[PDB]
Amino acid sequence: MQIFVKTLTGKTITLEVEPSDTIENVKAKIQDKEGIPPDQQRLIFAGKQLEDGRTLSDYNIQKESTLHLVLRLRGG
Amino acid sequence: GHMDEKITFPSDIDPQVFYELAEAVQKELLAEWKRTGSDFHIGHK
């Protein structure tokens, strides 16, 4: 499947994933597209911040769906 | 002093998605971006 990660600029980076793709692995694909380490992304979906240990299905994110890149600001 | 605060919107983060995403996330983030003062390095490039 694919999903549309809208950057906070609004550059929608489409990427191919699986409903069982973990956020850790999705963020690694984002790092491949955007150049931001996964540990430093704050991935958002519909206002829900996702966590590394979870999956697209854990948030009921399916194909042809839209995500958001936000920064962690590595606050701690 | 001068330029004690410097929220910036690079080729990776722009106000429009910020206005369009969940308002509660925008408020939380805006507090992040202004408490650091210069948002550290939004876009991280």
Is A1-76 a domain of CATH 3.10.20.90?
yes
Measured CA to CA, the distance from residue B33 to residue A49 in angstroms comes to 17
**Which experimental technique did the depositors report for determining this structure?**
NMR
Range A17-20 contact pairs with CB under 8 angstroms and sequence separation of 24 or more: A17/A56, A18/A56, A19/A55, A19/A56, A19/A57, A19/A61, A19/A62, A19/A63, A20/A55, A20/A56, A20/A57
Amino acid making up residue B45:
K
What token pair was written down for B30?
Answer: 């805006």
Burial of B39 (0-12, 13-18, 19+ CB in 10 A): buried
- The three-state secondary structure class of A19 is coil
The answer for A 1-60 residues in CB contact with B (under 8 A) is 6-11, 34-37, 40, 44, 46-47, 49
What is the edge-to-edge ordering of all strands in the sheet holding A12-16?
A12-16, A2-6, A65-71, A41-45, A48-49
Nearest to B13 among A8, A46, A47 (CB): A8
Closest CA to A44 of B37, B18, B16, B43: B18
- Residue A49 has, within 13 A of its CA and on its CB side, a CA count of 13
**Containing structural domain, residue B27:** 4-45
- The three-state secondary structure class of A5 is strand
Give how many domains chain B has, as a whole number.
1
